[PDB]
């Protein structure tokens, strides 16, 4: 037995069904472009119950009651275990409208809103849109330029690298501000499609204008090729660092988030993710506890008032939850 939301158990980084949830996320995020939400989500949590499940599911027998695995899923499930393959999931890899969408939804700055209007304008390819450079954002420019390096899958070396630089940039703008390591990199992951960061100073407001500080420090080293800064949402740089390397270098994406330390607890939950494991918190919270959670806090909508927490740890008591460490949110 297996509880209902994702926020409820423990999902490792590595597992006995990546077949099998690999097909069912092709669907989710095929159900994404289509603008089909719904669909997405009862993927999305199909596959994550696979993810959490101790053996590899070797015949349909092992489904089991446990939530989340409808019909559609099922006979998913059922097809690539007779037949070591699904028709619909292979109709799906093989057609143009689902290539195009992720071709073009995978570059920097590129949601599926925007990938989705090109697709019904003709565009195609990488090249139409260099053709067409009046349609696009200074970000997307920067996305399509860098292409091949962010496409590659950024490691754990070029995490600790980065960590390096910008926790030099951080400790010199600012003595006594901290850089925590989030996103996929603190859940565990040996791979990833960028490098997320949360900034912050143990006092309140120290914080102000840090940023700028440290994005001249990275520039001045040659090593931003791109950033856009953003101005209760957090501040922000998405960036582009160049990332040197023996003979060579490489483009990675960065996110660099500053927290007040008040909000920092509420922001490393929510940058550390997985995307799945926060939907399914924030679900939790409000249907089980009626609490709306998110980055910056954890209100109580009827008695008008915020949480104050310390730590992760904290939040997932006030919730009624059994602590999870990043390692056990890969849902
Ligand atoms: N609050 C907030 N959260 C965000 C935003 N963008 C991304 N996140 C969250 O940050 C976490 C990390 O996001 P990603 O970097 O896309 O995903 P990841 O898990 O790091 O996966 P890889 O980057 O591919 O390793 C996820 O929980 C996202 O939901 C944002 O603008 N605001
Ligand atoms: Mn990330
Ligand atoms: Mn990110």
Same mark, same amino acid.
């Given at each position: 037995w297996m509880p209902a939301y994702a926020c409820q158990r423990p999902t490792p980084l590595?597992?006995?069904?990546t077949g099998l949830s690999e097909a069912l996320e092709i669907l989710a995020e095929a159900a994404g472009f289509e603008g089909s939400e719904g669909r997405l989500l009862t993927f999305c949590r199909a596959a994550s119950v696979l993810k959490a499940? @101790?053996?590899?599911?070797?015949?349909?027998?092992?489904? $089991?009651?446990? @939530?989340?695995?409808?019909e559609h899923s099922s006979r998913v499930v059922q097809e690539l275990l007779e037949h070591g393959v699904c028709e619909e999931v292979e109709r799906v890899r093989r057609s143009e409208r689902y290539q195009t969408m992720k071709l073009f939804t995978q570059?920097?700055?590129?949601?599926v809103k925007t990938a989705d209007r090109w697709y019904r304008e003709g565009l195609r390819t990488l090249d139409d849109l260099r053709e067409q #450079? $009046? !349609?696009?954002?200074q970000q997307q420019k920067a996305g399509l330029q860098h292409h091949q390096d962010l496409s590659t899958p950024v490691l754990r070396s070029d995490v600790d690298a980065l960590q390096q630089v910008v926790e030099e940039a951080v400790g010199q703008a600012l003595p006594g501000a901290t850089v925590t390591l989030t996103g996929g990199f603190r859940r565990? !992951?040996?791979?990833?499609?960028d490098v997320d960061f949360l900034i912050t100073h #143990? !006092?309140?407001? $120290?914080?102000?204008?840090?940023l700028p500080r440290v994005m001249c420090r990275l520039q001045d080293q040659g090593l931003i090729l791109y950033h856009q800064h953003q101005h209760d949402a957090f501040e922000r740089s998405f960036c582009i660092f160049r990332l040197p390397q023996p003979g060579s270098w490489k483009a990675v994406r960065v996110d660099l988030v500053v927290a007040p330390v008040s909000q920092f607890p509420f922001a490393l939950l929510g940058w550390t993710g997985s995307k799945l494991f926060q939907r399914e918190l924030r679900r939790f919270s409000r249907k089980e506890k009626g609490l709306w959670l998110n980055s910056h806090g954890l209100f109580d909508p009827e008695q008008k008032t915020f949480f104050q927490a310390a730590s992760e740890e904290d939040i997932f008591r006030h919730l009624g939850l059994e602590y999870l460490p990043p390692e056990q949110r890969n849902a």
């Amino acid at each position: 037995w297996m509880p209902a939301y994702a926020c409820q158990r423990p999902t490792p980084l590595t597992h006995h069904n990546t077949g099998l949830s690999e097909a069912l996320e092709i669907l989710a995020e095929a159900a994404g472009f289509e603008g089909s939400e719904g669909r997405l989500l009862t993927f999305c949590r199909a596959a994550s119950v696979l993810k959490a499940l @101790p053996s590899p599911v070797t015949t349909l027998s092992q489904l $089991q009651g446990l @939530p989340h695995f409808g019909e559609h899923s099922s006979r998913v499930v059922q097809e690539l275990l007779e037949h070591g393959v699904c028709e619909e999931v292979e109709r799906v890899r093989r057609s143009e409208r689902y290539q195009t969408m992720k071709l073009f939804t995978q570059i920097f700055g590129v949601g599926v809103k925007t990938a989705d209007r090109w697709y019904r304008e003709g565009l195609r390819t990488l090249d139409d849109l260099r053709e067409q #450079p $009046q !349609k696009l954002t200074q970000q997307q420019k920067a996305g399509l330029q860098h292409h091949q390096d962010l496409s590659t899958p950024v490691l754990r070396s070029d995490v600790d690298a980065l960590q390096q630089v910008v926790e030099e940039a951080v400790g010199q703008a600012l003595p006594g501000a901290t850089v925590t390591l989030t996103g996929g990199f603190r859940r565990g !992951k040996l791979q990833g499609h960028d490098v997320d960061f949360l900034i912050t100073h #143990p !006092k309140e407001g $120290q914080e102000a204008g840090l940023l700028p500080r440290v994005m001249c420090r990275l520039q001045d080293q040659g090593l931003i090729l791109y950033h856009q800064h953003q101005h209760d949402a957090f501040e922000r740089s998405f960036c582009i660092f160049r990332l040197p390397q023996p003979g060579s270098w490489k483009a990675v994406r960065v996110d660099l988030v500053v927290a007040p330390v008040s909000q920092f607890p509420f922001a490393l939950l929510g940058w550390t993710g997985s995307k799945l494991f926060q939907r399914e918190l924030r679900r939790f919270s409000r249907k089980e506890k009626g609490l709306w959670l998110n980055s910056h806090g954890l209100f109580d909508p009827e008695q008008k008032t915020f949480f104050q927490a310390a730590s992760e740890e904290d939040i997932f008591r006030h919730l009624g939850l059994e602590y999870l460490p990043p390692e056990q949110r890969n849902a």
